[PDB]
Design a protein around this nucleic acid. Structure first.
Lengths: 141, 49, 185, 57, 193, 124
RNA sequence: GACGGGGAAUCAGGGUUCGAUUCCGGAGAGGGAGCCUGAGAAACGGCUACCACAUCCAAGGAAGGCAGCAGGCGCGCAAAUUACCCACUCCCGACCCGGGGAGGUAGUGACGAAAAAUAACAAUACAGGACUCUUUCGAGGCCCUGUAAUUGGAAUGAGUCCACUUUAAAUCCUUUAACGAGGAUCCAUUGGAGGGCAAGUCUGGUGCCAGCAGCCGCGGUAAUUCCAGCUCCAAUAGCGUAUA
């Protein structure tokens, strides 16, 4: 504290108000631009339809082909890319199918060596990928 | 004992299945030859008849 | 506008350290020694001890000759000597802070049934409690976490309907006797 | 080989090893009794470094 | 009314619970504007209307079994899935094509047979009124060969907001109450495109 | 054997009955039926058992303690005056009309739709 | 992405975030406008016109507003019975007597909270530990402790099913008959095992491919990190993931 007086409270309150506004994490949650630019719209999960199965590549140190999918949303129609999580689950996803899309867990940031992804696939055709991986549910037709 | 199968869920429905088939089979036994149901008149044809 | 209660509270608390070797060793030593089931019961014993210690600290913060401090301290001390964790000799407000977990876990029903002299092991005592055998003052109690008091200490006995305290024989004895009578007659 | 973009190849070409008929592990209160016995009853005074519970040297 | 029935569906058999039995007056037909009555039990040789809570995918012309027992595990539908695994006349090829929509399953199947004879694929088989979801799925197919980016709606009304969103990004709805007028409109659209 | 003990006994001159709390002791056996408490209170207070109304018997945990209430009237018509109808139905003294609420509400609405004397014949 | 407050979560001390939500007050019944009656209304389960949507119509006309209780559509990541009763708590009326989707009761229900099964005992198998001596053998092991698909009787519960009890009538709980377990097949899952961070330098397959990985990083034909088996570790009827 700099202004240390007995009847100095509105100066301290206003100064801390502007210095609280002059931040990054608090300013991200108190402006509508970050929420409107977010394709989820402040939601935890989201639905969408598969357009095509793409393959993106890793970064400089490690070399692999991380296989993803291009999904366009239900609620607004934004076009995102989502990473199919586990091994060999790209057979379970076909084109023009409903998927449930969630984040990675770094609050809208790229995770690991995959560039540009912020989303991952939890369910396809209203059945979970874990049951399909473990041979517990079958894809209806 | 060793008479039945290993688990219970793949045999407990067999009692229900045999109950259903004996209930329907007896339902095919005691039948009345008079005062039956209503049949279906089934109208077919061409355009503008 | 319905007529319900909606009043509840959590009785345990999860520790800040999920993986600490000494804490897990001490908790497993307590579980094995005092015949517990899992970590939630020793955590709830720790939680109620922490509440008692916090209340004693808040009472000891205030000065003497206060009616609120004197009344609440006398009520807390009388309740603790009624439960059986203290005695009349250590009848002070500042002696509450020297109490430990095993002083509370000694007053459990399972340990008292084991150490009174009618059960073989503490696990056998818990099994015997859970199958409706042990009663206190003509009341069948089938739960091991029953904190007995000092005045109800000398009234732990088998129930009247149990075969151990004198009653009808159980299912295995009657079935085996029926098999013996069928084979011999 | 086949292709570089073959999905799920290592899951599909690995050998299948069946499960083993093992005894039912007791769960609940007596598992903690077994843990307490094996940790703090059967302990032997050793020297140097104590091996882990899964130390398969 | 206190029993569970098993109806065949698109995604295999589905088990429901009966809610009511709507019966028309004997003077009128079953295609009447909401003039029905409620009954607890019905006599034999009657045309009733069983309504439930969640079916939304059913194939007609197939038997239904009334289970007087408790369906504690889905194994009492084994004879029914054995009956549906043979004689599948209406094979549902869920390919990538025109999103079709009709008020009735029979009219929808007739539209699918028209598209099959016209060598046009179909994607969606939704029954009922046209909503924002169907227009949005047509907008999904507005990329990657947008020739089949139309909604075929027959004898059913589109909502106002669905048309309002459809004209914004260019989804065509061939709403027609006459089936051959709809056929001629689709053929003229294909020729002009 | 089965014995009962009264508790919180009081008389009510202004309502012509007597309130009490009944503590049934049945060790070994199950909960006794209410006719046993009725005839026991009949031969306990030297009264005809047609005016003994008992209810609210809940068996305690432990097998042998049962707590319930009891009304001891001085007359049969006085018991008919100040009593709920379901207890008299339980003793077989009162009968209720067997019509559900939906039929009554629909009949009320159908009589509401028409005026005059036709209300008598629109609802049977 | 503001109904206000009593309050809620986190919480040494100070603070931060939420409060549509059972109690109080305010506002509306598609949204504006106007009014009759009545003590009390700008009322909408009252009326009169406008716009948007919309029902029947023999086409001249007529009848409407579930942000009440059930239910349906859409919207979505997101939310239950088109049940029974006025018996309890109260409310309105000429009035002990009628009515109340106010309310109570049951069904769905892993939002969440509390208690609490999935085992104990006895003898031999074979491993230790304590006692004067036998320094080291082995016995004494009368007092033990552990675990071994060796054996043996003695217990009660989940479930089926009579009665009793509860209740407006049931159902639920409690009591109680008769049956009800040895590999007690009456079978406990969810994550993880390089470090953070508790726990294999075990055995097979791929070879910077497939994949793992919140972060460092791991895969290049001997992988303590991939895919499977065995063992182990953390919590336990619960555990993992995503967002504020």
């Amino acid at each position: 504290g700099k202004c240390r007086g007995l009847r100095t409270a509105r100066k301290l309150r206003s100064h801390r108000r502007d210095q609280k506004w002059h931040d990054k994490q608090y300013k991200k949650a108190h402006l509508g631009t970050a929420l409107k630019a977010n394709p989820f719209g402040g939601a935890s999960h989201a639905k969408g339809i598969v357009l095509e199965k793409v393959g993106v590549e890793a970064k400089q140190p490690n070399s692999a082909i991380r296989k993803c999918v291009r999904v366009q949303l239900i609620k607004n129609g934004k076009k995102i890319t989502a990473f199919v999580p586990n091994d060999g689950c790209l057979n379970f996803i076909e084109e023009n199918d409903e998927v449930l899309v969630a984040g990675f867990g770094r609050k809208g940031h790229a995770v690991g060596d995959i560039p540009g992804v912020r989303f991952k696939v939890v369910k396809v055709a209203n059945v979970s990928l874990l049951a399909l991986y473990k041979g517990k549910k079958e894809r209806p037709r | 004992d060793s008479d039945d199968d290993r688990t219970k869920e793949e045999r407990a429905y067999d009692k229900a299945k045999r109950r259903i088939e004996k209930r329907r089979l007896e339902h095919s036994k005691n039948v009345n030859t008079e005062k039956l149901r209503a049949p279906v008149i089934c109208v077919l044809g061409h355009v503008d008849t | 506008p319905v007529a319900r209660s909606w009043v509840c509270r959590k009785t345990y608390v999860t520790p800040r350290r999920p993986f600490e070797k000494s804490r897990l060793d001490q908790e497993l030593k307590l579980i094995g020694e005092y015949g517990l089931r899992n970590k939630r019961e020793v955590w709830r014993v720790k939680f109620t001890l922490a509440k008692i210690r916090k209340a004693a600290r808040e009472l000891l913060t205030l000065d003497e000759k206060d009616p609120r401090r004197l009344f609440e301290g006398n009520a807390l001390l009388r309740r603790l000597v009624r439960i059986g964790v203290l005695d009349e000799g250590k009848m002070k407000l500042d002696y509450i802070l020297g109490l430990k977990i095993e002083d509370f876990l000694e007053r459990r029903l399972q340990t008292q049934v084991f150490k009174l002299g009618l059960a073989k092991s503490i696990h056998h005592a818990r099994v015997l409690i859970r199958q409706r055998h042990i009663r206190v003052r003509k009341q069948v109690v089938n739960i091991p976490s029953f904190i007995v008091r000092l005045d109800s200490q000398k009234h732990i006995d088998f129930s009247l309907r149990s075969p151990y305290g004198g009653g009808r024989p159980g299912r295995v004895k009657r079935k085996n006797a029926k098999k013996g009578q069928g084979g011999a007659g | 080989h086949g292709s570089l973009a073959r999905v799920g190849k290592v899951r599909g070409q690995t050998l299948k090893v069946a499960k083993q008929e093992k005894k039912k592990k007791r769960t609940g209160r007596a598992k903690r009794r077994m843990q307490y016995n094996r940790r703090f009853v059967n302990v032997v005074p050793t020297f140097g470094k104590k091996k882990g519970p899964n130390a398969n040297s | 009314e206190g029993d569970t029935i098993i109806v065949p569906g698109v995604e295999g058999p589905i088990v429901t619970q009966i809610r009511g039995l709507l019966l028309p007056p004997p003077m009128k037909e079953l295609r009447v504007k909401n003039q029905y009555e409620k009954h607890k039990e019905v006599e034999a040789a009657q045309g009733v209307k069983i309504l439930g809570k969640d079916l939304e995918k059913t194939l007609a012309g197939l038997p239904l079994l009334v289970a007087y027992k408790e369906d504690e595990i889905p194994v009492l539908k084994d004879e029914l899935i054995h009956e549906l695994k043979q004689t599948l006349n209406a094979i549902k090829l869920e390919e990538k094509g025109v999103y079709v929509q009709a008020s009735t399953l029979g009219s929808l199947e007739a539209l699918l047979e028209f598209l099959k004879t016209s060598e046009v694929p179909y994607a969606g088989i939704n029954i009922g009124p046209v909503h924002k979801k169907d227009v949005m799925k047509a907008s999904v197919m507005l990329e990657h060969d947008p020739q089949y980016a139309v909604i075929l709606a027959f004898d059913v009304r589109i909502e106002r907001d669905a048309q309002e969103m459809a004209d914004s990004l260019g989804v065509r709805i061939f709403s027609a109450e006459i089936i051959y007028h709809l056929f001629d409109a689709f053929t003229k659209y294909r020729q002009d495109y | 054997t089965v014995t009962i003990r009264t508790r919180k006994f009081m008389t009510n001159r202004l309502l012509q009955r007597k309130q009490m709390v009944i503590d049934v002791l049945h060790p070994g056996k199950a909960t006794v039926p209410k006719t046993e408490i009725r005839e026991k209170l009949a031969k306990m207070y030297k009264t005809t058992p047609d005016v003994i109304f008992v209810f609210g018997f809940r068996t305690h945990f432990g097998g042998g303690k049962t707590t319930g209430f009891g009304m001891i009237y001085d007359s049969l018509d006085y018991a008919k005056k100040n009593e709920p109808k379901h207890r008299l139905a339980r003793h077989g003294l009162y009968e209720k009309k067997k019509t559900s609420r939906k039929q009554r509400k629909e009949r009320k609405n159908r009589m509401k739709k028409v005026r005059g004397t036709a209300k008598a014949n629109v609802g049977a």
